[PDB]
Design a protein around this ligand. Sequence first.
Ligand SMILES: [Cu+2]
Ligand SMILES: [Cu+2]
Ligand SMILES: [Zn+2]
Ligand SMILES: [Zn+2]
Lengths: 153, 153
Amino acid sequence: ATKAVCVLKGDGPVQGIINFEQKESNGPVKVWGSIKGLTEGLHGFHVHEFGDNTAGCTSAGPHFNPLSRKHGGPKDEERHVGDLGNVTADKDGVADVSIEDSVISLSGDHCIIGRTLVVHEKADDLGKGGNEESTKTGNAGSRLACGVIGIAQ
Amino acid sequence: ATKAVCVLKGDGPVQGIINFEQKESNGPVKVWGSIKGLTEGLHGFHVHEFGDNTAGCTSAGPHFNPLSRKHGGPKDEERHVGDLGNVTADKDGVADVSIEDSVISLSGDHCIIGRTLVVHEKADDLGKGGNEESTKTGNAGSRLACGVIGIAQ
Ligand SMILES: [Cu+2]
Ligand SMILES: [Cu+2]
Ligand SMILES: [Zn+2]
Ligand SMILES: [Zn+2]
């Protein structure tokens, strides 16, 4: 148990304290929080498996996969158990996050604690992008800020 | 087949890498690292509970302590959970390290991923040096750098 945390940052001039609150056994991770500095538009907003912030945002791994799926948006069943959404930066990029996914957990299985959350640079192609580079990531270019999903209070 | 990593970043010159290997359900745990630019001879090497690092090292609270024991000795009977003691920063303060301790297991009940490991500024005195203080936090002084234990490579 309890309320995860994650504060994103990297060579990107962007950043963000992002929160995670999840009650009843398994089931709906409530994620809300904010992230500044960035360039308006959509941004991919994933989970990367390895919580190695070892050497940047390279180490995080590809998207969290338990039995290897291709990509998806949150709304599908074709999706990795790591890829949450796309997130919008409006002007002067307060990309105010709100989300309520049912796949990613906080205690058992789809264990994201000590995993990484990456907010990306290009706009998420969400599957629907008819190339293999989307099924791989969803085409969202850099890893601009990242951090380990640790444990707040 | 658990693994873990921790990039011990602080905002003094102090920049570290440190990991936890440990198997076969109740195989002890290991730490091997490279602590850096740390003041000679003896430093605090703890693991504080909430892997909240919002405000860097200080939101990580008390040592990982499920039990409500007093301060830990590297090996006391009555040791925090989170204090693993001291480390030796060979002259120029590189601290090549190694621990094998019973207590800092990461799976079947009691796992510490999603927590912080903070390396303390001064010479950590075991607690038993009776003072409800030295017993708080082993008379260690600042937290000069931290990192979150997550699943690694
Ligand atoms: Cu991604
Ligand atoms: Cu401490
Ligand atoms: Zn994906
Ligand atoms: Zn302690």
